Amino acid sequence: VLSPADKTNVKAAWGKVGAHAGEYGAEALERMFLSFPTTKTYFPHFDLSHGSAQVKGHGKKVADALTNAVAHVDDMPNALSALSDLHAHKLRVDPVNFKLLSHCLLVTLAAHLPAEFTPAVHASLDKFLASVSTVLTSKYR
Amino acid sequence: VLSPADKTNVKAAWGKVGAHAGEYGAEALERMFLSFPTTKTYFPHFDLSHGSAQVKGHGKKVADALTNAVAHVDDMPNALSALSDLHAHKLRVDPVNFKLLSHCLLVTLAAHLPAEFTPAVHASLDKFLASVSTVLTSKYR
Amino acid sequence: VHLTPEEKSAVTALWGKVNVDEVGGEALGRLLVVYPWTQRFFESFGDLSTPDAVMGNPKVKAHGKKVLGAFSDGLAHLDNLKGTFATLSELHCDKLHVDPENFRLLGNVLVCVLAHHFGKEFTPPVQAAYQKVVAGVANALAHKYH
Amino acid sequence: VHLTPEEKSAVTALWGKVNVDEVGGEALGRLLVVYPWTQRFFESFGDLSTPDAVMGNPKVKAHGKKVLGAFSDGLAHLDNLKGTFATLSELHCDKLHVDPENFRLLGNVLVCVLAHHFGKEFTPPVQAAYQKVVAGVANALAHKYH
Numbered sequence: 172v173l174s175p176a177d178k179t180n181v182k183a184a185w186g187k188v189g190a191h192a193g194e195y196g197a198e199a200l201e202r203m204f205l206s207f208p209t210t211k212t213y214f215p216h217f218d219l220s221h222g223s224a225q226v227k228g229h230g231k232k233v234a235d236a237l238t239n240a241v242a243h244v245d246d247m248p249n250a251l252s253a254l255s256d257l258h259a260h261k262l263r264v265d266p267v268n269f270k271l272l273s274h275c276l277l278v279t280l281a282a283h284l285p286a287e288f289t290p291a292v293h294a295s296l297d298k299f300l301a302s303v304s305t306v307l308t309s310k311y312r
Numbered sequence: 313v314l315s316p317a318d319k320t321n322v323k324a325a326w327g328k329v330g331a332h333a334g335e336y337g338a339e340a341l342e343r344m345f346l347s348f349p350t351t352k353t354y355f356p357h358f359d360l361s362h363g364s365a366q367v368k369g370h371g372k373k374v375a376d377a378l379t380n381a382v383a384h385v386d387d388m389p390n391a392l393s394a395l396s397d398l399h400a401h402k403l404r405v406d407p408v409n410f411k412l413l414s415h416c417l418l419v420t421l422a423a424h425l426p427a428e429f430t431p432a433v434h435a436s437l438d439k440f441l442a443s444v445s446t447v448l449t450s451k452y453r
Numbered sequence: 454v455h456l457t458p459e460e461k462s463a464v465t466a467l468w469g470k471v472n473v474d475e476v477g478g479e480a481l482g483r484l485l486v487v488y489p490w491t492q493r494f495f496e497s498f499g500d501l502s503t504p505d506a507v508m509g510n511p512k513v514k515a516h517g518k519k520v521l522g523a524f525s526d527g528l529a530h531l532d533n534l535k536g537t538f539a540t541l542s543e544l545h546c547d548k549l550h551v552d553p554e555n556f557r558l559l560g561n562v563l564v565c566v567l568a569h570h571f572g573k574e575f576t577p578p579v580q581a582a583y584q585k586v587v588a589g590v591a592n593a594l595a596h597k598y599h
Numbered sequence: 600v601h602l603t604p605e606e607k608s609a610v611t612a613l614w615g616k617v618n619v620d621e622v623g624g625e626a627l628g629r630l631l632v633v634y635p636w637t638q639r640f641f642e643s644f645g646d647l648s649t650p651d652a653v654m655g656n657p658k659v660k661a662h663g664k665k666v667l668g669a670f671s672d673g674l675a676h677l678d679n680l681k682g683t684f685a686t687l688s689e690l691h692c693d694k695l696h697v698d699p700e701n702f703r704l705l706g707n708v709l710v711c712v713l714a715h716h717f718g719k720e721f722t723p724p725v726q727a728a729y730q731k732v733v734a735g736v737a738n739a740l741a742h743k744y745h
């Protein structure tokens with residue numbers, strides 16, 4: 172549901188994220204637990220407190236997983252089918268939460284790449300995070 | 313984002329409606345217009361009173377649109393490609409309206425097909441209409 | 454909920470003809486099946502891996518049983534729902550952590566279960582009022598988020 | 600609503616440094632670009648066919664200031680957001696027909712704007728506060744739908 176132009180920036184953005192992917196995923200994850208407390212319950216086995224190590228251990232995973240979706244952005248439902256089964260069947264995450272973590276990613280990316288967060292990119296990124304989300308929440312039964 | 317089994321219930325549901333198509337689309341529309349009245353503002357010139365031949369003309373145009381979608385099921389962005397330009401670039405229909413309309417086609421079918429509106433079924437048409445809407449609202453620029 | 458007499462009549466007429474025992478359960482089963490993530494709030498119910506055990510499942514029917522009683526509650530408390538569902542508001546929100554969109558989904562399903570059993574006798578006009586009733590309860594329910 | 604003196608501090612603090620001449624327009628611009636169906640409510644504004652087009656537009660920058668304005672008024676009456684927005688709610692719901700989900704998206708756009716301007720000075724603890732506010736306005740504005 173994207174576009175040629177969109178994908179360009181999704182990269183242009185990823186680009187200046189590069190090997191910061193983990194620093195960010197954490198902040199997103201943290202901004203999320205902080206701004207939207209209910210999302211915490213999905214992590215009881217978690218010391219969520221600031222600087223939490225496992226929290227960062229997650230941040231890097233999520234980020235990397237996104238780095239994947241950008242590369243295989245044209246075959247998503249497929250290249251991320253292991254995560255859908257995890258998030259839809261096993262974990263059973265409310266689709267509403269993917270909206271929050273996505274907003275928090277746009278915020279995070281926002282406050283760390285002021286030059287790549289151009290209206291047209293923001294729009295793009297938003298669309299991208301939108302799709303990935305529909306994926307990870309699309310195998311419910 | 314539909315399992316091969318979904319499509320099954322979509323065709324055994326589509327079938328059991330057949331000639332009622334244009335008829336039910338008109339009923340799906342009226343329910344939307346009455347239950348969700350803001351939706352009316354997208355049809356400024358129409359006459360949306362009961363038995364409005366205008367609604368019924370359109371209701372069918374809509375139901376045909378669907379059977380056409382229930383056809384190129386796995387190449388939807390492309391089959392319904394053009395309608396995506398009307399609701400997304402020309403009409404700019406609030407995506408929330410689609411959800412409203414979809415909920416009405418549903419209620420319309422469960423009141424006219426108790427013989428085929430079982431759960432596994434219900435969730436199939438919903439995944440479907442949602443994917444239908446995602447596309448018709450997916451081109452916005 | 455600012456409903457008219459018309460919309461009050463059409464309703465209380467069709468609610469009497471409601472299977473106070475089977476609809477609540479028909480609804481919750483349908484939510485759980487179509488909006489599967491809702492299943493997370495019901496582990497202690499057991500088997501819900503398929504649409505059938507879900508529908509069949511006793512707890513579901515047992516629970517849907519109570520749920521509807523709450524709908525009938527407000528369906529004769531239309532001038533004060535915010536009150537009517539306060540405790541229910543406190544439960545689902547502060548204690549259960551149920552995202553309010555879901556209430557709109559359940560009630561939207563409740564309108565589907567009603568549209569199933571009463572076929573034709575469930576007209577667009579009726580729907581519009583119920584849609585109003587469900588909206589009320591739904592929001593009235595999300596209040597400990599307001 | 601109801602934040603905490605800890606929160607009230609970080610917000611009023613941050614709000615101060617906001618350029619009450621750019622931000623409102625920034626948010627309304629991104630709203631229009633990111634969730635384009637929203638342009639529909641703005642035919643009267645003119646050119647909005649491209650990001651630069653929209654962002655450049657002074658009609659947008661103009662309306663943006665009015666919008667920001669209302670937030671400011673609201674931040675000032677966190678204890679009465681519902682009343683504070685009472686007329687704007689009749690306006691937006693009965694009169695204009697905006698769907699409430701959109702109030703929630705403008706609020707999130709605003710928050711992305713504060714992050715873009717204030718970079719890392721915009722911290723999780725602070726955004727959390729703001730999220731409490733924009734949700735508040737969003738809910739306040741939606742009352743003629745409640």
Ligand code: HEM
Pocket residue numbers: 210213214232233236237254257258262264268269270272273300303304307
């Ligand atoms: C941008 C969207 C998201 C992406 C790309 C993503 C990605 C991932 C990945 C890659 C894993 C671990 C995979 C593995 O090691 O096998 C994971 C785990 C998990 N995710 Fe997500 N996720 C997203 C959104 C969410 C949301 C919104 C929630 C709900 C708050 C959530 C909750 C969880 C939970 C509970 C786990 C298991 C954690 C554990 O116990 O180890 N995710 N996610």
Ligand code: HEM
Pocket residue numbers: 351352354355373374377378395398399403405409410411413414441444445448
């Ligand atoms: C199930 C999802 C929907 C489908 C399949 C659908 C389909 C269609 C079709 C086939 C047409 C006529 C296309 C043409 O001949 O050029 C049309 C027109 C139109 N649709 Fe939809 N639609 C859907 C949802 C909606 C919604 C939610 C709205 C918002 C209320 C809407 C508003 C309109 C309007 C305003 C027109 C132009 C009517 C005219 O000027 O004659 N549609 N639609």
Ligand code: HEM
Pocket residue numbers: 491492494495519520521523524541544545549551555556557559560590591594
């Ligand atoms: C707006 C429609 C709904 C109504 C009227 C409703 C009503 C009720 C009622 C009356 C109870 C029993 C309260 C008690 O006496 O302990 C209950 C319990 C419960 N509900 Fe709902 N509910 C609704 C929607 C939902 C949704 C959408 C979910 C999540 C998907 C949900 C999840 C639960 C859970 C997990 C319990 C068990 C509480 C306990 O016993 O600890 N409900 N509900």
Ligand code: HEM
Pocket residue numbers: 637638640641665666667669670687691695697701702703705706736737740
């Ligand atoms: C929740 C955040 C929002 C706030 C605080 C807000 C505030 C305002 C204010 C203060 C006015 C001008 C009132 C006047 O001078 O009479 C206004 C006008 C308007 N707003 Fe909003 N608004 C918000 C969200 C939205 C959204 C999401 C839309 C739809 C995309 C929208 C569409 C409009 C339109 C079309 C007008 C023109 C009204 C007229 O000229 O009579 N607003 N808004």
